[PDB]
Amino acid sequence: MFIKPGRCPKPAVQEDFDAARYLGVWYDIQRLPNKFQKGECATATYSLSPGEGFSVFNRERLANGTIKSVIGSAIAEDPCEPAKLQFFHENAAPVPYWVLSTDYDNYALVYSCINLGASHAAYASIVSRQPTLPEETIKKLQGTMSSFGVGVDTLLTTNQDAAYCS
Numbered sequence: 811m812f813i814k815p816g817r818c819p820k821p822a823v824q825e826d827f828d829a830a831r832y833l834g835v836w837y838d839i840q841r842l843p844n845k846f847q848k849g850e851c852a853t854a855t856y857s858l859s860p861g862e863g864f865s866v867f868n869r870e871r872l873a874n875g876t877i878k879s880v881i882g883s884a885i886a887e888d889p890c891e892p893a894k895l896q897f898f899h900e901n902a903a904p905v906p907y908w909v910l911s912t913d914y915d916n917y918a919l920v921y922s923c924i925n926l927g928a929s930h931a932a933y934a935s936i937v938s939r940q941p942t943l944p945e946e947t948i949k950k951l952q953g954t955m956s957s958f959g960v961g962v963d964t965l966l967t968t969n970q971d972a973a974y975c976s
């Protein structure tokens with residue numbers, strides 16, 4: 811279903827966010843169950859764009875062994891708030907992409923809440939520069955998540971095993 815009652819929180823974001831340090835490959839460690847991501851081995855690649863934002867290439871492996879991917883764009887509508895991006899894909903309405911925390915080199919926590927009148931749709935990933943992330947880092951980030959109405963108990967652990975994902 812993925813539609814949940816109540817409207818979105820406005821969590822705090824990475825205040826000093828440098829999109830240039832955020833570029834390259836990020837691996838999905840944990841994610842909320844959502845509509846689009848039906849697979850495993852989920853990676854996001856962020857690329858140089860002429861403009862203010864960056865180009866997005868998201869990639870996953872489905873249960874039948876097929877690779878499915880999407881291209882989009884992430885751009886901060888307010889350069890006072892550079893961690894509040896909007897994600898543009900296809901014909902779609904932009905969805906928020908909020909970097910709540912990153913050290914650029916190890917981890918990020920990303921959130922997107924879509925308001926649907928009285929209900930909402932939430933995306934939340936813990937990502938890593940590696941296919942794994944220390945259980946301490948995941949605990950801290952899960953801690954941030956619980957503080958704005960995400961249930962850590964809903965989080966999928968993403969399969970990043972080279973034997974399936976190669």
Ligand SMILES: C=CC1=C(C)/C(=C/c2[nH]c(/C=C3N=C(/C=C4\NC(=O)C(C)=C4C=C)C(C)=C\3CCC(=O)O)c(CCC(=O)O)c2C)NC1=O
Nearest residue numbers: 838846847852853854868869870878920921922933934935
């Ligand atoms: C928390 C933020 C977050 C947002 C804003 C989000 C949105 C989002 N992810 C999508 C696809 C996707 N999203 C991902 C992966 C990712 N997406 C990411 O933002 C990140 C960090 C990864 C993983 C590292 C994948 C693999 C797809 C393709 C799904 C498919 O087509 O099978 C789509 C397009 C749907 C489509 O056309 O199929 C949207 C709008 N998902 C998220 O996780």
